[PDB]
């Protein structure tokens, strides 16, 4: 019975490589009793989003300054179509799903 420390390093490694890697975990692990923080359902996953935003934000000062983002737009009619995850960010997230695994202490599995 370990969920509050798999939360914690699952935060972490979410809250480094955005919530594709979240994607990539919850499909896999989907029903998983371990893993279903993942899933808005559960008591962890109160704990568990709260960790991704202390992992991604942090508790350091900065002062505000300057006009806000609000104001004016990129341009009108700007839309486009989504780009495929053929970049490095793929080969990445599946070293670093590994990676979250073993230090875990989850079992391996072959190609």
Known sequence: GEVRNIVDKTASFVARNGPEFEARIRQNEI???????????????????????????????????????????SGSSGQRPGDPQSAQDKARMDKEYLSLMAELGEAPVPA
């Open 31 to 73: 029903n998983n009793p371990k893993f279903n923080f993942l899933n808005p359902n559960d008591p962890y996953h109160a704990y568990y989003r709260h960790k991704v935003s202390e992992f991604k934000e942090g508790k350091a000062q900065e002062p505000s300054s300057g006009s806000s983002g609000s104001s004016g737009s």
